[PDB]
Structure formats: structure tokens, C-alpha cells
């Protein structure tokens, strides 16, 4: 059969084959360097290594039947999959990571390590499939730190075994003493030496021979390259964790620097800092057109009709006329957030915007005094006749009322020429809106 | 030897830059070693003299027969003629740097004996090394590998300079006098390089300096090592960030989109469709949007890049044979690229046609649920939106994208408002519609 | 009674509750790991713990009666506030932290969200944001240093005192027996371990080796966090001066490319020096985009009513008129010796002078007919006729409020009597001069 | 009598001559106060340098009481108004605190405390103003930023070194291992040995390296942990500032290389032809060697309008005086065209306009070499050079031939040409008042149908 490389079956398999690759790297090489450890646990390592080899066999057997993408559709000819899999170098790596070399020296089994691209593909797929991406990136870099620490601990203990045990002050001490003879102290002291050398603290005993001098120079170099390359990466990741709050803080201290420079009055100071605190307390600071400018029209409008659904399905006339019309309008919508005690419309200003009320209440207030004529909840709309501009009525071509805000309102702005080019194809909803406007005119 | 050597496609000139960079690396990396360390003895003196003769012959050849043949631009046109090339090279700063380098202080070997301090002028020719760096970074595909290798080489060279300066300080203090200086029991360059690493990386652990020259030496060396390690941090972070900035920007945009869709509780079907869109966009286009990359270029290279990619499709279609070339050029400049996920409806039967779709790397199908004709890459559909004024006509079929179809969109109103300029093209397209 | 969550009383309460939480973290880990600071001042820590629990239960009641926002309004239904707070996890954390050897009080550290909300509210409200970010960063690393010191003394107590060479020495000896010496030595050990200096004594046992490995990896990540936060502080502290230096550098290298004359470049450097000396590096339209329209209008009507209280001819407009005006007035600044409009030029702009002394002149002749100062405006007669009236020059660094044609045309709608009177005054000046 | 311009070069020379003794006051006053041997040995030199610093401070209060500021755009020169504006400023309180005559206290105590001259350090704002003016003046801003940061951390290292020597003098010398050793030893008794070992201590602490002897007493433990925290924040400042300097040095090269790699990725994806690949990459190489990769409107969008027009004059009119048509045209249309010009760059072998298209653009050659050609290949009729023009007849829509407004020929670019674009809509919008261009281009249409 064929498997989908974007499904969940391929990802669960990717986890089940990324487990013995990491086992092979770390565990395998840790055992090798510690020949005595191998001696102590031989049947357990043989069982685990036979499990890793049968998983590598099934790995090449399932990479021979994975599909790819040519001409944008899934290919499923199994002979074409076998030819396309034979015509790459990853399959050459699966062939060389499969040879049966072996129970005394596990340095002969280093061909199992060659399947590193599978573990890297697992790390990339889990990074793009998790819900904590920067936390997983910090965890991935921490796991790379621990791999390099373990590998240099094994290399330090092996080069101490090659130089001899306890002959110098730099090398690992004499094994036949029962204090340094424990395998736990072997691994833990090699881990301590390699943590010190790779983080360049350097409170290890100094070398006395030239092989050890060259090894400590090389080791030091690697550490100062490696840690700067990977630990600096972590620093960059941090900034990516804090970047959105940092740019909102950049906006707030630029605004507060301007109003400290211009000596703005304290009432408007407290008002604008209350507005910014309201915006960050309600988490409406992410500008949705700027964050979804990359996406195409269908996915932008499907995101919009799945966010604004419960306060957009409350429309009377333009509810069942044309769903594609509604799709185009909610794609072309544009939200603004208003303060309480704010005028949306005034008597005598030119109209260019229509307002859909979302999560707020607005009251039509009178010309001189504050008399709440009618409060408009969510789902309703206003500000349509001054962007329709129709004949037969009083025809003032301005905004004919005052719309004030009693609370922290949010509206949906839409431009007049934008509505005109959206309704030049659809005139039925325009004459319905026109009829409503006419009725309004008749009333007052 | 050609008559005039250019820079862009002369691999022989790149090998000559590699040879001049090798000779400059020999001088700049073996003059302090032969100056400080006792390696320039009477036995290897034929080897060191023949190496300096080979490097000065390479310098003289680069002065005489390569650099007065370099092409350059003057007033817009390229300059080929040799007397003007020679005058342009000889008025430059590279010429006076090279002649200031080639001042043969090997004639002072008879004056004050053998001493490589007189050979220090061959380190002045650094412009050839910098143009070699620029040329290899120009022709390589993954330039960040070479940039990381060059930063590693800069760190190894400044450590070698610090090892040579430490060995000079120990020879000036006397070998083995105090406990700070090099005591003289192993390999001299290896132990001095170990001192240079554990000073310039600011690691410590070395013996404490006793007298005043050693104290001010360790002071200045640690204070320079803090800035050298800081510049190493900055260069490595800058090179790796400039390597992976495209993938990091795409991953940041995908993370912001998923954060928005989970901040406003969008269902799992739409999140799977947005995830599949982002993954196919990265696997196909390797970038977020191509229009933002186009609209920072000049308009004539934008039109050239547009015609070179879409003229094959727009001429493969038999329905686009009677149009005109200015129509073709402006319409191929103003095409908008879009991508449809498999199973989507690009035009449902009953909607008003407002876009003319051009297929490019996709497989679509028109459909009730029975297929009528599948359209391959480079096909066209949506021609009925040429005469629709306002609403006009509806879509006459359900055309469904079968795979990951990457359609090219062309609107109705822009099509009509450039099409009113051309009544002959409008007439032949109306005759094709009839 | 309901507490407004964006008020000032709520911030006073965040201060009054973020004092005992910062007490609980610091002093509970110190008392629990030291066991002598607890045993000496028993009644003192008992009465401070009683005060901390009283402030905790008052915070439970305040978060029970604090109002939230639905439909943009204040909710005063205190029963609805009780259910809304009770279905949240903060209520579960509060009743977990109010559950009655100071190691039995470790549930009092669960109110960390109040301290974090206090730090965020101060980082919004205060007038020193970068100074508060530095104070918060040093407070975080001091908490980490103190917690590591307590952890080191706990591990030394668990292994025994003075048995090895890595642990704290024998506490029966009065040199190491004092509490001040104990706490300052644990603080010194954790500074040495976490800043990765490594002057600590080397460990002996396996658990000590493992703790020093884990502690050095934690110290590497904490030092990377300090370097990243201080680098971000430096970058957003000098970002504005750096981008204006980049603008100056782009100007200067473009003029060095195009070979600028000396007087024109001296005018350019004098203009940028006037900008740098009068602190007009801030851009009004660039920084005020994040505000809403009326909040953009109210600071603008403050500053432009301060500039419109000076003028005399166009004060017949009031609220609506100036609201449409302060919305669409923009500032431009002119050099000394600058011409605003000449004789043979078409008019398209009106100006309002604030902070500038302008003088009208004859045809290439310095004759002050009238010196326009703060208190008048100009440039409106050549738009409702030909060409601009006569030459206008600048004495000093004058600042003008430019005004487009569309603005005054839109201003002709409301309050027409003032505008027709002022254009009659335009005709007055026309019949005066010609 | 005269009032010094605060933006003049004489004011900057005064800023140098007064930032010298303030920096001397900081550095050698904390040294003289902490050592009491460098104070004692060179007493006549410190007396004459302190008298120099006092007379320069008196000259600085006399200069700051005589410099003018900018109000209402004008430079005030009224000395009474300047003295009033200086008297109502906190800088005058700082200067009268800084100029307290401590010669009385210096002779009263008996010359063992140079701590009584620590009010002389309060002109730090003058030193910071000198550093700001040198930053906005100099030609190597990265090098001056590195020199300023090195001078700041050198002042910090010297101050902490003198603080460490004063602490070891307070706890006594050589009682334990952390403090400075027993100064009665003649190897530890040299003044230069004292200062250089104390600076070595301060750099080893503040640079988080730490090879010093470990502390013994509680005050030494507390001073070493406060000093280590100050040192790790200073090391974070050094790494962040060096990373900022490295980013500032090559951010333009990095964004240009990023644009090249992004367009290379786009052209390797969309399977463009290889000659077009080499053409676009040689195009970007020529734009980098030409020192022109950023567009002039994106450079001059920050500038005011008259200054932008003056840059347009100084760049374009030296080419526009080499014309053959604006001898019978006027300066109003010269300045309107120089407002309406936008430069485009071209490539060799690239066509401007072919035969028989409806173009609506006019072009002015600037450092280029173009030629009109036929469709048979390279048959150059006439080579055009700097100071020519083409594409002017097809925007007014005048006839007199069988063509109309169609481009009569093929125009290619021989070299790396650089044109000035003038489209139909902006030129016919701005040029609505002058018929000199109308009569000149009608003569152009008449003679182009003559030669047609
Ligand atoms: N004139 C008017 N507008 C009303 C009334 N009730 C709600 N509205 C809305 O208030 C409006 C204010 O702005 P518009 O002129 O744009 O359009 C008007 C209507 O949409 C009413 O009784 N009269
Ligand atoms: N119905 C139909 N449309 C086709 C076919 N081949 C190409 N097309 C185009 O596909 C279309 C889809 O949208 P339209 O109804 O707008 O108009 C239709 C045609 O322009 C075909 O075989 N049938
Ligand atoms: N002609 C003229 N304009 C004046 C005078 N005083 C102020 N102004 C303003 O100066 C102007 C310059 O530009 P305008 O022609 O646009 O209109 C003119 C007036 O608004 C004066 O005495 N004469
Ligand atoms: N046909 C032609 N055009 C020329 C010549 N010299 C300069 N030009 C300009 O080149 C042009 C190319 O475009 P146009 O047809 O727009 O108009 C033509 C002229 O303005 C010449 O000898 N012949
Ligand atoms: C290790 O210990 C054994 C027994 O004490 C001894 O024989 C041997 O020489 C020691 N090895 C070294 C290198 O000292
Ligand atoms: C500490 O000292 C006391 C007496 O001073 C002694 O009884 C005790 O054994 C010592 N501790 C250790 C661990 O030896
Ligand atoms: C310092 O040295 C002097 C003599 O050299 C000696 O008398 C004195 O005791 C010493 N002090 C200390 C603290 O060692």
C-alpha cells in the first residue's frame, strides 16, 4: 500500500523510528566507550540492538512505499515509488546502515548511526506540528547540548583509556582503586570534565603531555564554536518568545515618550494609557490583516467566517441572499475599536464608512442633549445612507444622526467605494439596503 | 592568457585569486612564526627562501600581467581596450597598495642578515584576499558554509598571532625564569597556542603573572580577548542568522497564524487546511509570497521575469493566439498567483464569474458529480467572464481542483479596462466566444 | 462595591499584594533551607506570616468582587462576578494557597500571577520603562541566585558538613558557624557557579558532581538569558538614534556618490543638527497610528488649539470645524532663508504659522512689508481666485502647518459664513495690492 | 560681546577644550583620592593641573552664560535674556556647586584629602554633550561608538580598581589572601605595581574571568559578589554592544545579500532561463558596484520639500543643461520636471521600446549609451548619449503621419544605461500651463514625420 507523508500514520511511524536512531547515537556509543558497561549488560544490549535492526529493516521497507508530490497530486504507483526511492542517496544511506557486521567491541556497529536524516525529519515535523513551537526549539537545542556533552565525555574517557589510566594528572585515575572503579563514577566524572571543557569554565586538571595539550586545545575550540553557535541560538529563541509583548511595549513607550515630550495633559494621558491597557487586557492588539496578508482569499474568508460567525449571523436582509457575497464582504471588512463616550457619526459630516456592531452597544444620541433614542446591540448596523447616496429623499449627503458609545465598543468599518465595487455585481441586496434607506428617510 | 580578464565568468581568474590568496596567507601566517619561533634555522633556509621567492614571483605576476587586464565599467559601457585598462588600473588604490607591498626588502638581507621583519610589506596586499572572498561568496550556492569556515579561520589566525606574541614575551623575559612564561619542555608552538586559547577565550587556569610586564601583558590580553570572543559571538550569530533568516521568517509567520487561529478558537478542519497550505507553500515555493519579492525590483526586470515564466503558458493556449503583445506584457505583469488545496471549489455553479484562471502546476477537473474534462497544466478556464457587465453570467459548471492546483488569477474588471484599448483583440475574443 | 480593574485603586492593591508574595518566595526558601533564620526570629516570622495570610485572604475577596468586561461595559452583578471568578483556575490556585519547619508553607508561593501582573502593570504605567525592565531583570537573577544558594546549603546539609571539600565546612567551628557567614558563603558559591566562573572547590562525591553539572548547564542558560535581555535592552534603547543615524548615513553616502556642493551639504548637516538639537526625530504620523481616531484628534486638538488661540482671522470656527482641521493639519519645518511661495507660482496650500517668524519680500529684494509672526496665518488668497501674490521668505527656523486643497474645500461645508467673510478679506487684499 | 553659535565649530572646539579637564578630573581625581602616594609624589603637577581645571571651569561658566538658544526660529543674542535663561536652569545650580572654592578647605585640612575636590566631577553633562556632538559630527561612527564604549568601561575598570585598593587599604595590607599584599615589601611597594596589579584585579573581576585569590572575610565575600554581578552585566553590555556594532557595520550588505538570495531562490523555483539568471545577477553586481541600490525617493522621503527639490537640482540639472530642447523652455518647467523625474536603471541588450507599441513614457538618458536599431539585428542607425531624449511624441496624441502614437522604432541599451522616466499622466497633469513644450514637441512631431 501507500502512506501519506502529511498524515498522522507517517508521523506516528516517524516517532517509532526516531526512537532507535537516538538510542543508537547516545546509548550505543555510550556503551561502546564503556566496554565494561557492555560486559555488565550484554543480553539487554543485544535485545535492544536486534530491535533497532528490525526497525531499520521495516524503515527501508516503508520508505520504499511512501508517496511524493508530482503535479500537485499524490502518486500511488508502487513501482514508480520504488524507482524514485532507488534514484536517491538517502536509500544508499539506508543500505549502508543495514549491513550485518556483528559481541565484544561495539565500534563495529557504527553503521547504524547513518540514519540521522530521519531523526532530523522527526524534529522538524514535531516542531511544525506542536502547539509550543519556541519551547520545543529550546528543548531541541538543549537536547543537542546534552548529545555533545555525552559524546565528548565518551571521547575523553576513551582517550584516557588510550593514554593509560592514572599515569598523569589530566587523565582519568587508576581503575583498580574501588573508588574510581565504579561505572557510575566513570560516566559521571567524564560528564563533569566535558561539561567544564565545553562550557569553557576550565577548572579541570591541566594537561601534561602533548597529545593531551592538542586534545584540550581542539576540545576548547569546538566548545567555543559549538556553544556560541548553539547557546546563542537559544538567546535568539528567547527574544522570539518575548517579541510580541516587546513590540507592544515599543508602541507604548514611543507613545508615552511623545506625550512626555509634548507635555500633554494628565486627563488625556490617563485616558490613552487606559485605552492601551484595555487593548492589552482584551488581547485585540494583533492586527489581523497584517498577520494574514500572506494567505489567499478563500482561507482568509473562511478564517473570518469562523471567527465572526456568532455576531455576523444576526443580519436580516443579507443573510441568505448570497453566501459568496457575505464571504467577499467579510473578507473586505476592517475592524476598529472605539472608546466609551465617542462619536461614530455627527450631524453634517461626509459619510464614507458603514459600521457592523460587534460586541458592543451604541446609542443614537440627540443633537444637543443626551437622550438615548435607541441602543443598538451586536448584529445590527448603521451608517449606510451616506454611503448609498440615493435620490428621492431629503438627500443631505451627510451623516444624519449622532451615534455615541456607552462602552468599549468594537465596530466593523467598510469603505463606501469598497461596498460599491462589492455590490456592482450584486444589485439585489443593494436595492434592499436602498429600500431600507428610503424607509429611514420617510420616517425622519 | 586572454587579452582582457573579466570578473563574472573567469574560473581561471578565480584560480589566480586562489593562488594569490594562498601566497598572501603564506606570508601573513608564516612571517610572525619565522620571526618569533626558532624555526628559520640554517637547515630549512633553502625552503623558506624558495617559498618567499615563489610568493614574490606570484606577486610580481599579479602586478604585471593579470591586474592590468581587469575589465571595468566607465560611463555605462564596459571597457575592453588595453591602454585604457592599464591607465585605469594604474590610477587606482590597488596599484599603489601592490607597489607599496612589492618594495623588495630582500636587499636588506645583505645589510642586517636574515630577518623576516623586513618582509612585513607583503601583508599589505589584502585587497586580493578580499576580492577572492567576494568572488567565492558570489559563485557558491551555500555561502554560509564558507562564511563559517572563514570566521573559524579568522579565530585560528588571531590565536596564532597571540601564540607568537606570547612566545616573544617569554623570550624577552627569559625562558623558564618565572612561572608565567613558557617553561620549555614540550612542543613550543603547541604549548604557546594552548596559552593563546586559554587567554584569548578568557578561560583562565594558567599560572599567575609575577612581574610587571607579565601583569600588563595578561591584562591587555584578557581585555582584548573579551572583545575577540564578543566579535566571535557576533560574527557567528550574524552569519547563521543571515543563513536561516528565510526559514525563520516563514516559521514565525506560520506560528503567528496558528497563534491567531487558536486565540480565536478556529475549528480543526480549517486549522488543518491552513497547516496544509503553509506546508505545501514551503515545499513548493520556498517563500511566503512572490509578489512582495517582485514589487521591490525595477519594472523592466519585473516584466522580464514575468514574460519568461508565463509566455510559455499564455502562448500554449490556442485561445490566446489572436491577442497583441502589449496586452500580453501588461497582463503577464499584472497576474496574481494563488494556490488551491485539494478538494476545493474554485468556481461553484451559480456564482458570478469575475476571474480568468490560468493553470500552472496543477490538475483541476470540471464536474453534477460526473467529470466532463480534466485540465492539465498550462490550460485555461473561465473565459465566459469577458462579456459579463456587473453580474452578467453565472458559472456554468462545478470546476474542482483535484490536486494541489496553483492557479494564476486574472480579474474581470482589469481585463475589460485594458481590453477596451484593443478593439481587434476584443473582436477576436468575442468571435472565439461565439 | 465593585473594583475597576483598570483603575488606580486596583494598582495600589497589586502593590499591596505583590509585597507579601515577594516576601514568600525569598524568605520561605531561605528559612526552609537554612533552619536557623527560622529558629532565631520565630515570633517575627510568625507575625509576618500571619500578615501574609491576611493579605492572601483579602486578595481572595478582592478577586471575588473585581469586575470584568462583557459587551464593553462594567459588570456590577456581584453574583455574576462570583460565578465568573469561581469557574476560573485562579480561584482554585487561591484556595490551594490558602490551605493551613517552615517547609509546610510552600503552598504560599502559588500566587505568582499577582506578582507577574503587578510587574506587567508597572511596565505599562511607569515613565521609566527601560529602567523598570533592568530592575525586573536584576530582581529575577537575584531570586535565581538566592534560590541556588539555598539549594546548595540544603545539599550540603544532606551530605553532611565538612566531610568532603565541596560541601560547606564544619558548622561546629565558629568561623563557619555564624548565620551571616553561612548565608554570604552560599551566595558566593551560587554567584560563582551560575555566572560560570568556576573558582569553587572541586566536587568529590557522585551526587556533588551531578549537581555541579546540572548547575553549570543552568548557569550557561541563565547567562545566555542575561546576555539576550541586556542586548535587547541596548537595541530598543538606542534604536531611534540608530535609525536616524542610518537616515543621516544614507543621505550622506548618496550625496557623496552624487558630489554635492558645499553650501547645500552644509545646509543638510545644519538641518539634521537642528533636528538633533530640538528633538524632532519623532514622527507624528508614524507614531500615532496605533491610537483610535478621536484619541488621535484630542492630543492634536490640544496642541493645535494651543497654536490656534494665537491666530486672529480664522478663529470663527469652533468644535466641528477645528476637529476636521486638527485631524487633517500636518506640520512642515522650513530652514532660515527659505522661500515658502514665490511670485510666479500656482497656489495649492494654506499655512498656519506656529514657532516661526516669516517676512514677505519684493522681487529678489529684502524689504519687510509685513513680518508674519505667531498670531496670523497666510496663503489662502491664491486658491479661490492666477499665481501666488508676492515672495515669502523665512527669517529663522520656521514651522508651518500645511493644508491641502481638499481640506479647505471640505471645510467650506460647515460654518460657511466665516469662510465667505475671510475670502471677502482675500478680495480685500487683492483690491489693495492690485 | 559676541554670542557663540551652539552649532558652530568654535563651540565644538570649546566642547573639546572643556571635555578634556572634566575627563581628567574623573579619572585622576578618583586615582588621587584612592592612592595617596600618586597624590603625594607629583603634588606640584597636580596643583598646576587643578589650577588649569579651575580656570577652564570658570571659563566654561562664562561661556555657558554667553551662548544663545533658538526660540521662535531665531537665535537670541540679548545677553541679559541669556543670563536670565541660564540663571533659571539647573545647570547653573550644578555649576555653582561645582565651582565651590575648596582652596580654603584644601589648606584647612592640610593636603591629605583630595576628596574635597569631588564636586568638580559634576560637569559630566558637558562631557556627555561632547560625546553626543562628536557622534553626530564624525565620519567613523562605528569606530567612535567602539572608542566611547571602551572609554566608558575603562573608566569603570579604573574606578573599580581604585575602589579595590581603597578597600584593601581599609582592611589593611596583606592580612589575608584576597586584599592587596603587605606594602612594606619593596616588590609590592612600587606605585606602578600597585596600580597595575589593582587594574589587573579589576579586569579579572569585571570581565567575569576571575583568577584572583578567593575571599576570606564577610565584607570581601559581599564585595566580590556585588562586583561579580556588576561584571556580568558589564560583560552583557560589551557583548550586546559589539553585536550591535557588527550588525550596524554590515546590515546593508546583509539585506542586499538577502535580496540576492531570495531572488535567486525565486528564479531557481520558477525555472527561468540561465542567461536571464546571469543577467539579473550581473545587474545586481553592477548596482552594488555603482553605489546605487536604494531608490532616491526612499532616500529623500524623510526630507522637506524644498530641500528635496534642491537635491533634485544638484543631481539632475548638470545633465539637463546638456539638452537640445530646453533652450527654448523655461525654468518653471525645468523645476517641475526635476520634481517629476524618477530614475530607472537598465541592462545591456534590454529593449526600451520596440517598433509599434503604444508607450506613454518619456525618457532622459543619464550616464548611458543607447541606440535606435531595426528588427534585423544590430543595425544601429544613430547612437544616443547623455543629454538626449526620446518617446516624447506618443503622449500628446498628434498625427500628421500614418502611425499615430506608436513607437516608431526599437531602442536598445548598449551599456549599463540609466534613464529618467517621465510617464504620460504625471507630466500631462503637472504640465498644464506652458505651451513652450507644446510648440517644441509639435516641431518634433513635424520633423519626425519629415524623417519618417
Ligand atoms: N436618521 C436615522 N438614522 C438612524 C435611526 N436609527 C438608527 N439610525 C442610523 O443612524 C444613522 C447615522 O448615520 P447614517 O446617516 O450613516 O445613517 C443613519 C442610520 O443607519 C433613526 O431613527 N434615524
Ligand atoms: N462548462 C464547462 N466550462 C469549461 C469547460 N472547459 C473549460 N471550461 C470553463 O470552465 C468554466 C468554469 O466557470 P464558468 O462557468 O465561468 O465557465 C466555464 C468555462 O469557461 C468544459 O468542458 N465545460
Ligand atoms: N498680497 C499679500 N498677501 C499677504 C499680505 N499679508 C499677508 N499675506 C498673505 O500672503 C500671501 C502669499 O500667498 P497668497 O497669494 O497665497 O496670499 C497672500 C496672503 O494670504 C499682504 O500685505 N499682501
Ligand atoms: N524614429 C526616430 N526616433 C528617434 C530618432 N532619434 C531620436 N528618436 C526618438 O526615438 C523614438 C523612439 O520612440 P518614439 O516612437 O516614441 O519616438 C522616437 C523619437 O522621439 C530617429 O532618428 N528616429
Ligand atoms: C593501579 O593500581 C595498581 C594496584 O594498586 C597498581 O599495581 C598499578 O601500578 C596502578 N596503576 C598506575 C598507573 O599507577
Ligand atoms: C566538627 O567539629 C566537631 C567538634 O568541633 C566534631 O565533633 C565533629 O565530628 C566535626 N564534624 C565532622 C564532620 O568531622
Ligand atoms: C608586613 O611586613 C612588615 C615588615 O616587612 C611586618 O613587620 C608586618 O608584620 C607585616 N604585616 C603583615 C600583615 O604581614
Numbering used by the authors:
A (entry chain A): 159 to 260, 268 to 609
B (entry chain D): 206 to 572, 577 to 643
C (entry chain B): 159 to 258, 270 to 554, 562 to 610
D (entry chain C): 158 to 609
Give sentences copied directly from the paper behind this entry.
Cyclic nucleotide-gated (CNG) channels transduce chemical signals into electrical signals in sensory receptors and neurons. They are activated by cGMP or cAMP, which bind to the cyclic nucleotide-binding domain (CNBD) to open a gate located 50-60 Å away in the central cavity. In eukaryotic CNG channels, the main activation gate is located in the central cavity and is formed by two hydrophobic amino acids in S6 (the cavity gate).
As a consequence, the cytoplasmic end of S6, which is connected to helix A’ of the gating ring via a mere two-amino acid linker, moves further and further away from the pore and undergoes a slight counterclockwise rotation (viewed from the extracellular side).
